[PDB]
Amino acid sequence: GSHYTDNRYKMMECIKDAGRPFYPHKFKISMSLPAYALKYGNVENGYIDKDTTLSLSGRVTSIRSSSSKLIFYDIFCEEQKVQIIANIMEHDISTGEFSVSHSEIRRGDVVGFTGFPGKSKRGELSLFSKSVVLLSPCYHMLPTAISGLKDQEVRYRQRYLDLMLNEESRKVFKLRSRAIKYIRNYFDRLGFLEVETPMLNMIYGGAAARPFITYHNELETQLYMRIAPELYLKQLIVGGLDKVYEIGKNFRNEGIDLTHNPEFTAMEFYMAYADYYDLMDLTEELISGLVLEIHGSLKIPYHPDGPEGKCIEIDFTTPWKRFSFVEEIESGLGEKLKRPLDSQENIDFMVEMCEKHEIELPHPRTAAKLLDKLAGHFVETKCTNPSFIIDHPQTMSPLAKWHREKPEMTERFELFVLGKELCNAYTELNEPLQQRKFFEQQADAKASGDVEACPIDETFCLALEHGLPPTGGWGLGIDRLIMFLADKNNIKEVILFPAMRN
Amino acid sequence: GSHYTDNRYKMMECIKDAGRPFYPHKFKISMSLPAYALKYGNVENGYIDKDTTLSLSGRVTSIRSSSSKLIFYDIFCEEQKVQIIANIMEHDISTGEFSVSHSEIRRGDVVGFTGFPGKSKRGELSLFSKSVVLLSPCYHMLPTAISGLKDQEVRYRQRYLDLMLNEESRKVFKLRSRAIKYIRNYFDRLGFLEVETPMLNMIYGGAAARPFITYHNELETQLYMRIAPELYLKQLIVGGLDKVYEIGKNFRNEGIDLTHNPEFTAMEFYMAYADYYDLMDLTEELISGLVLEIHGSLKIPYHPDGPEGKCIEIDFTTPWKRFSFVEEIESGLGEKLKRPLDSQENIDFMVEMCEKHEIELPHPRTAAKLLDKLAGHFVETKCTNPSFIIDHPQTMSPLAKWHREKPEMTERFELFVLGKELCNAYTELNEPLQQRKFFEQQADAKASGDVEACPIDETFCLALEHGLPPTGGWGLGIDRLIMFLADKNNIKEVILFPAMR
């Protein structure tokens, strides 16, 4: 273990001292391994073309031998395995003696070979090698599969090992790219403009989350990492850009678990002249279309407890179920919330109800946080298939425009799948007087110890004073999306280098 | 000014008390203003279709009147202006009295109109309105153009005003999107995989830069914002992904100027089995092709001192000039650097030369920092057209692989345009023993006061011990790219919300 590594360092020193090949700068492949398979994969068993010499390269996944004169390698690159048959009778002695040449090679090494193409008598796609070059040695003994790792968390702390050994991990990251391409194309075809707004913020806002804090030394100013881009993106609608979207990181200085990483990838879009009804229709079309693209059906498997456990079929057939936020809580409770929803009376009542149904109390006990606890217990748990929870109270929705019909409510929805939040969207609040009021209430909750409440943002209020058109806005958690698309129950599966404890 | 804002708040309260329209939730347009222009722009002068009622919306850019009975608006939306002709004869009195309705509207307001399509007798594309709705008022008196702003830095502190008033700013951000689309497509067509790596780092590295520092409260751990993604991206090549790219923010806790913002957008790619010669050829093909796409030619204007100043024509015709880093310094100096380049003798000599040619001394006076100063003076200043500076010394290049031929050098290049760095690239160092050594030397320089030197990254060394294939890697500053493409001399022009004092 420890000894293998030291020996390998010693081998490489020896190789260098001996003037043998030591980390060559450039190896010129004749073609990729996939291209090789495509060209030679259909030749007859035992076919060899001694009139073509080719150079191939990959990582060694196997070493076997029949004699001191015949060695069999597998190399892997770009999802393709090719066998190398090294017969001493073909060995170019100018590269060294056969046994010396091959004694420098171990499983896990990145290597190059030259030789003649064809297929073994047994029908294996092969190169009949004349030489081998060590390009980049592996200094550690590898397992042949992830099951051989000391523990499965090595897959995340040393992701290169997972990628090396585990086709399923590679497929996830390819599916993620494909899904994001689909999403961009959806909006590009609607005439959206992709934008980038600051990740360093003088004032954080646009979500309910605790921020990361930092400091710009030259400008002598505290900054926050953005929890969301919303407050910048809306300024672009004031600016008249009409349809904008942004895809990138949010930073939330919070705990980690199966559906939470301190940095995650979100998409937000803002569309002038849309309301939240329009946004519900768009969400259905975008997401059902992506599901159909990936899976070939709107009904897809999900394994909450891993692949040998129970399977639920998630059905994305549109239109999706709607749950009215307050009404469904009241159905669950068998009684009504007190009005107004943010009165001390309703706070007291919601505390009683949390205690009665054994729901963990939030801190502080704001109306907003209590409502969220009750929603989490009574409503989110009904959202197995994609379901919209709609019409959130204003008290928990400071950037959402008041509901045109329903007192105390807003024109907001969240999309939930398997009980987890995927999207958050609303008819945007564009009336500066109440916006300012709602910011002041947020700053009061923050001063009372609500670490998820944001400070007042005057620059945003001033922007609203220049006239935000009627607008609909929307956010999607891309990591969580990939979790459902790829049937993973742990966000660490869909992020290359996720946060880990010590 | 101050009074206009208060009065507007008072108007809105009155409107609301009177039960008139107050921030309607939804206005259903019949079509976009561009679509309207396309459909009605070629009717004969004076044409009106009283059989079609349409709803249009935009921001009011103009209000004129010939009487108490006839008002002319311009509304602007989605790059299209349409004239609205409001004649009292057509006014739907159910929406209120004409004069009341129109008295609520000011220039800058977002509004809706309904009416009949056609064209004024003078040939102006118009809507003959029957009604108006105030959708979102502007509470501030606006200029009609950016020249009317109290000063031009309002354009950056209040970017919505620039976008509102200034077609040129809107065009820049559209060009930026188009350029990034072109770049993604170039690599997607090569079979690259786009990836995302952490912006929050236990250890920062992959560039020469001072980081932002933060803290994760739950894990009780200091973190750094990434200065570059390089050290993660290389691990993905160890992992066998073969061809990866990432486009996103870097964070560098430094001064701001015409070509520096504390957050900026960079692309990095890593390509197994490529070397820096391969990367030079790729750079030429990608960049020249993008220039040709945007401009229709490989020769483009640049105005270093603004649009009334001198103009330089930048020529992207390939292949581009190469300047060998050390040899060009020596040409400039008229004498040779002392060897080894990191010896005390060469440090002393480079200090003398900086003093002789009036180059500001760096602190600390490392070989790397001195070499950079001399390159900045003697080499970068020769790079008007896209030019590669190649073969940087190892001492200033801790992640670049040793040059296969030239001692003390590496297989590195930077791309310079108009004296500014656009790209940085190399044959990647994949030999863990030296890599560790060069990290240790960086950490020594850091301890001796080099605020741009990075700490040792053990996890990266361990990753190298699992075998990084021969690899070529590359970085591009997207903001700077847009500066040349769009002929801007200030990075604040190409970033929506740039840092300000």
Ligand SMILES: O=C(NCC1(O)CCCCC1)c1cc(=O)c2cc(O)ccc2o1
């Ligand atoms: O995908 C997530 N949520 C869905 C959205 O809320 C939808 C609207 C746009 C923002 C994200 C998500 C993923 C995380 O890792 C995470 C981590 C956190 O510490 C806090 C919230 C988080 O939320």
Ligand SMILES: O=C(NCC1(O)CCCCC1)c1cc(=O)c2cc(O)ccc2o1
């Ligand atoms: O585009 C830039 N430089 C070119 C690259 O070095 C090429 C290689 C990939 C990274 C960027 C650039 C833009 C900035 O605003 C900036 C700000 C800083 O405080 C420091 C460096 C910066 O550099």
Ligand SMILES: N[C@@H](CCCC[NH3+])C(=O)O
């Ligand atoms: N900023 C929101 C998403 C968009 C809501 C609609 N403006 C979030 O992070 O939850």
Ligand SMILES: N[C@@H](CCCC[NH3+])C(=O)O
């Ligand atoms: N990490 C480099 C760019 C890539 C260099 C080649 N690996 C920088 O920020 O300058």
